Q: What sequence folds into this?
């Protein structure tokens, strides 16, 4: 059945037919909704239908369904799954599949940009040194002196599960976290475990507050190897406030390039376990989550201190006042340094426009309200009042286990 | 369905185990392949047949005697048999007072979207099932308002009018809340008062209400008894507690002339107990500040005062990345909380309410085996991630007794 989604602010109603094309499961049932649950080695047998599905949708996309090339590709992929237990995507298919994995990412508010993705084919990589080279080129290309450009670098696909390529880092650029003897945490608390794994692997921590972690790179299932990103490649922004001259005295900074490196890219039944992809930041991703979460930098109290706010009772909303000011500073700093960044009002406004486009030309847009709504000022953004339908299309980005839980060392 | 389901809090690492989901009775609207969790809502002749009513009544009666640790008792088997005979001879049955009170408290306890359920067992239940006329409904509602208001020391309460019979004799409160402000659509397209209430205001004016046409005109009650045409009543103004909104720092804030009413009393929902349908069941608690300060004031299709407040704050309103909207939203919510606390009218900030809900949820998981919760509604409309419910996974499911949506009565009513 067709399904309608209403925006309760504009009263626009859109009709979803695209959900009818999905086959993966969401985790909900008719009686239980798991919409706020964060996470609810193929064979030739399972592989060909997935490949056939994806080839069919590719040749449908380029308006050549049932063509000579289409019939030939199908048979070409048929004989190759038979005789090799897998197949290899054409370059065109790889690009199409990566763009559509972004397009199908129900949790991403930045998808208005989806077809503007620079795809780096790294399927000929064999060693971690090679991965490091490919990754530096990604970081340099995507950073582009502050005029950030979305990119993805795709390493060789999984074969037997024993030879995976993995980026052990959760992002390419992240700050170290140090669990202090006195209990607390220096640096970034999100990364305490990974930082310890890098130290145990030989990394010599500077033990500052903003130490860029090394790359820890696993090629073809071998042990991971440490690499330092050349510092001239790592663009950073000192956070200052446009009114509070004392803000810069907090000593804060962040990196310009958000580049997620621990997810899995699935295309036509093939699994790409190393596929770092980058875009540019929405300001709340730094100023709200990375700075004010209890298990992150947790700087809310100091800012409210310097603002001389009454912090005795929660109903003074001192946390809310300090949160807005931190986010003002983040946007101001990136914009003053001409580093690409988007505020949650512009981003969500763009996403509503993106939804309109997708419903017109595609029949729907899978979208995860729980993730699309920004972590502050929810209802004064247009996505808050936008009903969304969440469903799982492929190609897709998926979660995968942390490598240090599966990898057999030597 | 799997027997145990785990939810995790990603801030504290606490993992909880849900078994209560196995008792879920109605559909969420999700399927295996689609999630409808952000859809807001996923005939008058049709009432429960005898065959439909039997299992629904037995399920609730069982649950009630289980709750009072008398399951399988003589009194339990007797009640079952008495209910069954009533349904056989009369096609319906009547709840005992004890069962009515238990059902109403559990409809609140089961309300997945309510952040305030830590209070669920402290609900004053007024049995208005002897009511016959809209004048009688007005009396019951005035008494409700006065008790729940309690001079600003608000107390949660529900008033339950007679259940549905054949569907042609419904009791209904046409108001969406007992106390709301009129909205008037002007000829020039602008709105005076509360734009959320323009349609209902028009209905009241058509029914004979003489509007004052101000910004904050308490709407009259429009009350339907026993399926008759609804009738208008003015709530005595001494019973409508109101708070003028001022700001602890901004002296000019009072010059906005804003005020709000103290008692949030939702009156358009349906209470379902044991297959019985109580189409008129106004219930009230007290406000979370953001229900006024974020939604009621700063929604675009509401009072929409963000801009005016930002002007008086001398913010740059040309670029969105100055976050002038966010800065103004906070100040408005500071004022709402400060004005209610100053006048000693119960109110709860979103930090306190969500922390209590977390403690509540944990207790329910411990003592009950779960707690249905709708994250999309539990997370407050501002500052979501700096409240503890943001990082708390939740399972949503529909238990009974429950509060249900129902069509607006002007759309179904058969005018006499
Ligand atoms: C171009 C600018 C982009 C912006 C502003 C943006 C914004 C965001 C934000 C705010 C989130 C939520 C993150 C969080 O709160 O933790 C998100 C999630 C996500 N983004 Fe985007 N994004 C961008 C580009 C991209 C690109 C280039 C890709 C891949 C090619 C991508 C794939 C994803 C995925 C897969 C998720 C959700 C991951 C999951 O399912 O857990 N995004 N994005
Ligand atoms: C005592 C203080 C209470 C507080 C602080 C509170 C808080 C809230 C809030 C913030 C919402 C979301 C409203 C919105 O965003 O529009 C809500 C919804 C709701 N509350 Fe509570 N509430 C309270 C009392 C009660 C009582 C006494 C009942 C019933 C006996 C109740 C039943 C409900 C229901 C049924 C809904 C959502 C209905 C729906 O749309 O599905 N609440 N509550
Ligand atoms: C390309 C891109 C740009 C951007 N501007 N933002 C992005 C955020 C995520 C993302 C995905 C999952 C995720 O985490 C899931 C759960 C917290 C563990 C997080 C949290 N860092 C971020 C992924 C990609 C992003
Ligand atoms: C007792 C009580 C106290 C309170 N403090 N708050 C409450 C809010 C609602 C409630 C329920 C549904 C609903 O909306 C239905 C659909 C969105 C239109 C609204 C919107 N007014 C409020 C109901 C009861 C409440
Ligand atoms: C589209 C979306 O479901 C709708 O705006 C919901 C979202 N969450 C909400 N949450 C609360 N508490 N109250 C609301 O009215 C809404 N509205
Ligand atoms: C429990 C909850 O699902 C979890 O904390 C989610 C909620 N929504 C989110 N939304 C975004 N954009 N980013 C997040 O990390 C989260 N966290
Ligand atoms: Zn769902």
A:
């Amino acid at each position: 059945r067709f399904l309608k989604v209403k925006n309760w602010e504009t009263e626009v109603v859109l009709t979803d037919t695209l959900h009818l094309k999905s086959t993966l499961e969401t985790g909900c049932t008719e009686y239980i909704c798991m919409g706020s649950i964060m996470h609810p080695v193929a064979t030739k047998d399972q592989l060909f239908p997935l490949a056939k599905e994806f080839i069919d949708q590719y040749y449908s996309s380029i308006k050549r369904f049932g063509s000579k090339a289409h019939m030939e590709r199908l048979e070409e992929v048929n004989k190759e799954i038979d005789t090799t237990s897998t197949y290899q995507l054409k370059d065109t298919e790889l690009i199409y599949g990566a763009k559509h994995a972004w397009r199908n990412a129900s949790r991403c508010v930045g998808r208005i940009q989806w077809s503007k993705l620079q795809v780096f084919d790294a399927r000929d990589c064999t060693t971690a040194h090679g991965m490091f080279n490919y990754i530096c080129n990604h970081v340099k290309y995507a950073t582009n002196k502050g005029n950030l450009r979305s990119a993805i670098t795709i390493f060789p696909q999984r074969t037997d599960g024993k030879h995976d390529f993995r980026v052990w880092n959760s992002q390419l650029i992240r700050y170290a976290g140090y669990k202090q003897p006195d209990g607390s945490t220096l640096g970034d608390p999100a990364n305490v475990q990974f930082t310890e794994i890098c130290i145990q692997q030989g990394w010599k921590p500077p033990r500052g507050r903003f130490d860029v972690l090394p790359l820890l790179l696993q090629a073809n299932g071998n042990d991971p190897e440490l690499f330092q990103i050349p510092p001239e490649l790592v663009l950073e922004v000192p956070i200052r406030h446009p009114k509070f001259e004392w803000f810069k005295d907090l000593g804060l900074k962040w990196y310009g390039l958000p580049a997620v490196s621990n997810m899995l890219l699935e295309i036509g039944g093939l699994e790409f376990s190393a596929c770092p992809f980058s875009g540019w930041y929405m300001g709340t991703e730094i100023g709200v989550r990375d700075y004010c979460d209890n298990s992150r930098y947790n700087i809310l109290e100091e800012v409210a201190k310097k603002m001389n706010l009454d912090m005795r009772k929660t109903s003074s909303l001192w946390k809310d006042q300090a949160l807005v000011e931190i986010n003002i500073a983040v946007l101001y700093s990136f914009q003053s340094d001409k580093v690409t960044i988007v505020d949650h009002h512009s981003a969500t406004e763009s996403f509503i426009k993106h939804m309109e486009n997708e419903y017109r030309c595609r029949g729907g847009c899978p979208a995860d309200w729980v993730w699309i709504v920004p972590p502050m000022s929810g209802s004064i953004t247009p996505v808050f009042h936008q009903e969304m339908l969440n469903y799982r299309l492929t190609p897709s980005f998926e979660y995968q286990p942390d490598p240090w839980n599966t990898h057999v060392w030597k």
About this structure: The radius of gyration of chain B is 23 Å.
